[PDB]
Amino acid sequence: ITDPYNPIVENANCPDINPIVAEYVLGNPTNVDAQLLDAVIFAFAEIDQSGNLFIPYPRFLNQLLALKGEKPSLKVIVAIGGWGAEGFSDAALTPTSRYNFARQVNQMINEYALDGIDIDWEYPGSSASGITSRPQDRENFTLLLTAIRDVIGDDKWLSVAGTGDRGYINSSAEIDKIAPIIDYFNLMSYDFTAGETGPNGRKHQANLFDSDLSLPGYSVDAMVRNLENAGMPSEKILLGIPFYGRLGATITRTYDELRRDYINKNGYEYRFDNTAQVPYLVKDGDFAMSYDDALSIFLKTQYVLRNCLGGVFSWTSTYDQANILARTMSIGINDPEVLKEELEGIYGQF
């Protein structure tokens, strides 16, 4: 071994970034471990048919807030939106509608003593999920974010969830204009094969780098670079990691389901794509599942540290009820030497 993979712990080119660890939390938050995390993002507040915010199961939000009893530094954020969530094109449309949305955001912050909000509009200018869209959404989104920041002030968190493909950057968001308004861009660098079938669905959903098993232009690295090139500061990007597997458009499984029923079980076999830097499963000779494991999370957290990004997040905590992946993500940021040592217990010294 002449070329050891020596982990970065602190990047001397950006000391004083203190990258964060977050999880989106969809549903019952019983297993969330605050000790691992800097932030939790409740998913989701909805926009009802009258334009009003709605929280389905408020006790779950309250339970996340109560984690601040154990860890007062924890930030508790509410995400508004999600895939299929209607209401944003209308909310962004006019000075009146933007005021109204911002008013409701701040009322929600005050009601729950939140640390801030995440905006998850999927996506401005696109009706891919069935939601209303308009060609004015991209410019109107900037104005909406300004309306929100103006009301909530500088000392509350504002983030935007989005992607780093060229289409999002050109058609959905004005990256250079939203950058100064937001604290974080939550890069959902996964789901690359959502919407692909046949041979193109039998590809990685979240490969770090390109390989023969990846879709052209779709890699975590490409999305980060596209965002940086479009004017998002590195330190505002949070790199998203899926805690589920995908095969094309039609198959998803939680990490807990993969461990129980798929990984080296039921005819599915583990593989690691050393080029793309992600694991996958094969069955009957075919690519059969794309997911993240401890090794790929080590490599993605090293990418965060090496590239002076703002941090890392998971989608979602409840897909990993034992906090196996969450722990890896947390130590990948905060104690990478321990993660490397653990990995050398499986792969030998590297």
Numbering used by the authors: 363 to 712
Give verbatim lines from the article:
Among the most interesting of the discovered proteins was CotE, an 81 kDa protein comprising an N-terminal domain homologous to 1-Cys peroxiredoxins, a central cysteine-rich interdomain region and a C-terminal domain with homology to family 18 glycosyl hydrolases (GH18). CotE is a bifunctional spore-coat protein with peroxiredoxin and chitinase domains that are implicated in colonization. Insertional mutagenesis showed that cotE is not essential for spore integrity; however, in animal models of CDI, when CotE is absent the capacity of spores to colonize the intestine and induce virulence is markedly reduced.
Here, the structure of the chitinase domain of CotE has been determined, revealing a GH18 family fold and, unexpectedly, a peptide bound in the active site. The protein was first crystallized from polyethylene glycol 3350-containing solutions. The crystals belonged to space group P21, with a single protein molecule in the asymmetric unit and a solvent content of 48%. The opposite face of the sheet packs against the meandering segment of the polypeptide following strand β6, which spans residues 550–580. Much of the structure is covalently closed through a disulfide bond linking residues Cys376 and Cys670. The Gly-Pro-Ala segment is a vestige of the cleavage-recognition sequence, with the Met-Lys segment constituting residues 349 and 350 of CotE. The face of the pyrrolidine ring of Pro2 and the residue 1–2 peptide bond pack closely with the face of the indole ring of Trp445. Further along the ligand backbone, the carbonyl O atom of Ala3 forms another charge–dipole interaction with the guanidino group of Arg608. The family 18 glycosyl hydrolases carry a conserved acidic motif, which occurs in CotE as D477GIDIDWEY485. As shown in Fig. 2(b), Glu484 and Tyr485 form polar contacts to the α-amino group of the bound peptide in CotE. Allosamizoline is bicyclic, consisting of a cyclopentitol ring fused to an oxazoline, which mimics the oxazolinium intermediate in the chitinase-catalysed reaction. As seen in Fig. 2(c), the peptide-binding site in CotE partially overlaps with the allosamidin-binding site in human chitinase, particularly in the −3 and −2 subsites. The peptide residing in the binding groove may be an N-terminal degradation product of proteolysis.
